[PDB]
Paper text:
Our biochemical and structural analysis of the E. coli MqsA antitoxin and the MqsR:MqsA-N complex provide a detailed 3-dimensional structural view of the free antitoxin and the TA complex. These structures combined with our biochemical data unequivocally demonstrate that MqsR, a protein previously shown to be critical for biofilm formation and the most highly upregulated gene in persister cells in E. coli, and MqsA form a novel bacterial TA system. Our data show that, as expected for a TA system, the expression of the MqsR toxin leads to growth arrest, while co-expression with its antitoxin, MqsA, rescues the growth arrest phenotype. In addition, MqsR associates with MqsA to form a tight, non-toxic complex and both MqsA alone and the MqsR:MqsA2:MqsR complex bind and regulate the mqsR promoter. MqsA itself is a two-domain protein with a novel fold that, unlike every other antitoxin, is well-ordered throughout its entire sequence and whose structure does not change upon toxin binding.
MqsA-F was determined to a resolution of 2.15 Å by molecular replacement using the structures of the MqsA N-terminal domain (residues 1–76, referred to hereafter as MqsA-N) and the MqsA C-terminal domain (residues 62–131; referred to hereafter as MqsA-C), as search models. The space group of the MqsA-F crystal is P21, with two molecules in the asymmetric unit. The two monomers are identical in terms of the overall fold with well-ordered electron density throughout both chains. The final model contains 262 residues, and includes all 131 residues for each MqsA-F molecule. The MqsA monomer is composed of two structurally distinct domains connected by a flexible linker and resembles a human leg: the MqsA-N, composed of residues 1–67, is the ‘foot’ and ‘calf’ and the MqsA-C, composed of residues 69–131, is the ‘thigh’. The ‘knee’-like linker connecting the domains, centered on residue 68, is flexible, allowing the N- and C-terminal domains to rotate independently of one another as rigid bodies (superposition of the N- and C-terminal domains from chains A and B give RMSD values of 0.35 Å and 0.58 Å, respectively). Superposition of the C-terminal domains from both monomers shows that the corresponding N-terminal domains are rotated by ∼25° with respect to one another. MqsA dimerization is mediated by the MqsA-C HTH-XRE domain. Residues from α-helices 3, 5, and 6 participate in the dimerization interface, which buries 1600 Å2 of solvent accessible surface area (SASA; this constitutes 19.9% of the total SASA) and has a surface complementarity of 0.69, both of which are well within the ranges expected for biologically relevant protein:protein interactions. Six residues are buried upon dimer formation, including Ser112, Lys115, Leu116, Val119, Leu126 and Ile130.
Author numbering:
A (entry chain A): 0 to 131
B (entry chain B): 1 to 131
Write the structure that this text describes.
Amino acid sequence: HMKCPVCHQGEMVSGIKDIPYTFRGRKTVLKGIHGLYCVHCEESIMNKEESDAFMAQVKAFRASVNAETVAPEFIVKVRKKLSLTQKEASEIFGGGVNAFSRYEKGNAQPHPSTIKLLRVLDKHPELLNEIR
Amino acid sequence: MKCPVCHQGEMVSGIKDIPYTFRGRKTVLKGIHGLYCVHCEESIMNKEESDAFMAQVKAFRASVNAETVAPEFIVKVRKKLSLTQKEASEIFGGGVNAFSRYEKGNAQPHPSTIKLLRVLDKHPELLNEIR
Ligand SMILES: [Zn+2]
Ligand SMILES: [Zn+2]
């Protein structure tokens, strides 16, 4: 019987839980996480091994988001390579009104498909007619 | 003639740009001839004027509607790329169950995913660039 050291009310019981996690505007569920969990406030306590498993999953998610994400500077370059204004690019690639104005200030993440479309248009500027 | 809606304004012949929203998409219908109330902007359009107006309304509805892709088309492109739905979901985005719902018609892909799938339908080899 260990009492939760955060809420000081509930009991910590060992279990396996799926943990929601958001990083750089991307969401995931960290699946099958072993640890002690407070029945009252859901605070988690992980031993050395459990923490290793958890952090490997967290860091694999971060690595993948970072590799997929593109710099504001890349977005501008691809847009300028296509001689598009921010408004035309938002319309052509997607994202809504002011999408590219926000993307280029580093103030928003494009949808994964917008990023990928940008990556393809970077290498294939001739495809612009197919998407406009 | 007095305006038949507000009863406190004269209807005058003119031309106006009329904003119009359809399925949450906004446009301005340009150069619409009609009688317009000076007070409340109620419009009265004769047959000929209504046909012109409705032809713009309908051309805008049709282009908005046509942005949607047949779920059949989504299956066509996916099979074509030798991808499962789990993989497509991971590649194109939308979430864990994305592509299963698209092909049942229970969800619409993001506009960029549609564009990316239309591009890939014509040039399926480019997947290897963004996989
Ligand atoms: Zn607690
Ligand atoms: Zn009136």
